[PDB]
Design a protein around this ligand. Sequence first.
Ligand SMILES: [Mg+2]
Ligand SMILES: [Zn+2]
Ligand SMILES: [Zn+2]
Ligand SMILES: [Zn+2]
Lengths: 97, 174, 109, 57, 76, 387, 113, 62
Amino acid sequence: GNADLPGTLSRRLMFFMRDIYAAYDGTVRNSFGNQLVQFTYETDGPVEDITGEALGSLSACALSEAAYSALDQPISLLETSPLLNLKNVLECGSKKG
Amino acid sequence: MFIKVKLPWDVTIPAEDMDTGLMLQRAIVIRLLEAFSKEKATKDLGYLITPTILENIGEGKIKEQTGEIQFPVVFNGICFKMFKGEIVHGVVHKVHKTGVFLKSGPYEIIYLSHMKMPGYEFIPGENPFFMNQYMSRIQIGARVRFVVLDTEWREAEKDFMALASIDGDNLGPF
Amino acid sequence: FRNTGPVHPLTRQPVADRKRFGGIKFGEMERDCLIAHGASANLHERLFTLSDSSQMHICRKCKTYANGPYCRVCVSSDHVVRVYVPYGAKLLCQELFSMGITLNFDTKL
Amino acid sequence: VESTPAPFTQACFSSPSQCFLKAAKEGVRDDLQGSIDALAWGKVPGFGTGDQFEIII
Amino acid sequence: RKTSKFMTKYERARILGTRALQISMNAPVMVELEGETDPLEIAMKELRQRKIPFTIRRYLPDGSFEEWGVDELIVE
Amino acid sequence: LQVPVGTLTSIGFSISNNNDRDKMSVLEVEAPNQVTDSRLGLPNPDSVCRTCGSKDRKVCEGHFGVINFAYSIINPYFLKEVAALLNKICPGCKYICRYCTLNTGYPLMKFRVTTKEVFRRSGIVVEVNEESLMKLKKRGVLTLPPDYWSFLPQDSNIDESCLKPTRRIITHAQVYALLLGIDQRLIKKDIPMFNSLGLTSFPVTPNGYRERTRIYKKLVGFEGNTLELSSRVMECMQYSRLFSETPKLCGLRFMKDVLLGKRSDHTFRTVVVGDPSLKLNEIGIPESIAKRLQVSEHLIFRSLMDGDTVLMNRPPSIHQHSLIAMTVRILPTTSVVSLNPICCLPFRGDFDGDCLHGYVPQSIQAKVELDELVALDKQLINRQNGR
Amino acid sequence: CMMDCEAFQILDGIKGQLVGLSEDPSIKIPVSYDRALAYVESCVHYTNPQSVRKVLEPLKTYGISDGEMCVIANASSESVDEVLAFIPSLKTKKEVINQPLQDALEELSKLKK
Amino acid sequence: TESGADHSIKLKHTERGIVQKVVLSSNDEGKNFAAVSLRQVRSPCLGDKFSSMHGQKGVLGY
DNA sequence: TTGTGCTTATCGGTAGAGT
RNA sequence: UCGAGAGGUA
DNA sequence: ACTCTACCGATAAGCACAACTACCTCTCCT
Ligand SMILES: [Mg+2]
Ligand SMILES: [Zn+2]
Ligand SMILES: [Zn+2]
Ligand SMILES: [Zn+2]
């Protein structure tokens, strides 16, 4: 159990964050229609030379690595595992009822 | 109908010779020279021999295909359209019992059928066939004018073959 | 290991038999990691060049697929372009036409 | 909401048949703006490499 | 204008790859290389000597593009 | 001959009509025994193609053929839209009349699509509203008026008769009759693809591409009862690979295994062991495997040797640092690859039976970009936490 | 717009430039040169400026389309009954009298010695 | 076959060894069965995996 | 085995509209 | 060889 | 004062996908 959940979460998050990239003007724009995600990168420095890097892809990869590492953690009753907690945090629109 | 109509091209240049910035135009002209020489054919345009005037050239776009760079260049050249309703002369090459050969230069081969000239009879008493029944002798080397008909073309060779008719006036050599 | 070997009948891709020359799957996670790194030439080569590579002919006067290529929607057209797409794209187009979907392609050159 | 039709990526996510049927019924036009759509048709995504072009002249 | 004026890693890699591809196809080298048998090394030498005649067209998201040059850009 | 090469963009989607289907079809015969003809597909037992030259199933593409139908059939994809439109407009008045006023005793009717519940046919069935019928029963009206169904034209094909009077199945011919007299603007608003309503043909899949053949042959010759023809068309359309279900390659899995996940050439997979002698950026490659592995170098294939770069990965790739470009280092050992034990952390694996499969870049550009972005020295800083 | 004269003059420039640096690293085509040598020997003129001006002069003062003026220059008729029988588009018209046409033919014969 | 066709079974890429015995047998239906056994001595190589009696598992590093 | 939509069906339910 | 069901590897 | 419809909010009732990646053998048929 819980061996497929990190993979599915990583796939969905990658599908959501793949198109995000940094533009030449300095803005963070989506590939679909050049939609503005962030006017400026909200990193606390220290180098702004990253122009062609895909910020969304690396963010999704980092979150996927965090999710896969949580698979080694156990579960405590009246509580949920860090993997399930991360899944619940990432899934906000689903829990509308 | 020999109107000098401009026609752009997208000739590519191999990466074997990319140098001599002070005289790179020599590589440009030799690249387009081998471009239309390789084709040396057309469907409804005609033929071209020399790039007289080069109008304008474009930016060289490169591609990752065996080191080839394309160049968009537009220029005008000499062509000829075989429009219907034109009197064009030609030189006879040989003669036979059917399909009389007529060459308007080596660019095309024109064939003449039986139902194109007036009432004549074949003369087999000599080596070359003659049509002197209507008081006109036609041989090889004499220029004879005729009316051009619709031109045909092939798939691979795409030769500008057409039909020759002597139904018009002033027939025979002049 | 593999350099060149037999391809699958349905899709022109390397087979998954180790006794035969076989092949190594380039999965979605590897593609995502390569996108994160930003290596596009490797991604293009692994998905198109060294993978199933095919060609498709599209009429430019009318957005139709032409089977030299000949377009039966119009008269014999001398302006037909060739696009290089993976064989999976052609298989998907055939499947879409079989299920009842017609695709229109507007080539840029 | 963004009025950007992406039938190919949506089909690649889940339910390809229904997504293709809805795209055909609506008559949308996929511009292949996404990275996955470009990759599926032999085109570079354009994030790191392909965002700029190289011209000799 | 309105650019970082510093060549990114991806642009540098693409330029090096294109130059190596050109050199591998028996192309003359503008820079002078002594004891070099690798096209990648010659491309690196040309990039260091900024004598490679390439122009970079950066496509802005709005649709406009700005033409730059390798000699104009500064490597790091 | 030769054709220009261009890029592909702006793909359009539309529902096939008769015109495009006939245009794409090549040599579409109407013989029941000519399903596997020599004109469409190589795998047919003829080793020849009518429209293409002799080839090894690599130079000949799959051609399409479309059979013809004696009677017209409405497109199943537009069935729901037609049923919804027919429910709104009254079928005796052609407006937005005995069916318009409640004082005439005619109960309101509702048009809907029935799926496998009555006759296993996905068609249009008109049903009288039971709530309105119950009110009429309280007034002493036990049965519907005999002229209630006078708006339906009498179908010459009167097969499948003797049905319930409250619910009737509308044939394809009657659908067009009810659509006649309706404003074209209203019809076009609900259905954008007005030209696709008529489905008089169905294509046949190429032999080289693909129970589907049996159903296609069963449709070559058909009798009346066009509802059965529509059911057959629906059944044979659902055998497409894009529809979910057992081949196991269908639906989302078809996409994953045909476009998303692919297998490539010039790849090797072997078990990995530890070798502290090797440098961090060097990978140990056995001399036996490297001799058979061929690379493409411009002077045409040469064997693998020292200095070449190979992209190494450990499946699954959880983070971007799993892909590392490592220089090939030939070792006397065989049937194994040697890796520095320090480099285990990026791969997240240990030397206990893990297999690292590498990728050999053939193009020079891929090799150049491999050691400039995916090299170990390029990935010194972790992109997750900055350490 | 080249009928006989300026098409021949540009060929002379090709011949003049062909003798210089005849060795070419690339390939050559002999079919194109054959098409020029064996077609230009049909009809020739004396001078370029005077002939062109006298040909384009009726094109200005009289109404003739570009296609009709090109085909009549290549045919080079010498009478009034010949032109009325060649081109069917010139039949049943009264826009131009035949006497000015006869004068035009005299000018064409005058420029050709 | 009697016409010269060869429906023979060959050894694949990774198949090798020394033939040990050949067994020929047939069933009551009349179908003939043939079995050929290939043997090869295996020595511990590098990638070989070894395990202990207490769950300790690893490969032969050197 | 469910999680999540997803789409009708179905129960009043009262708001206007009218007399 | 094309498939299905099992048993295992990280 | 006193009565009919009609779009509209909250519970049943069926569909409809999807439950991880890369791997490797063995029997069964197809
Ligand atoms: Mg382990
Ligand atoms: Zn067409
Ligand atoms: Zn064929
Ligand atoms: Zn009505």
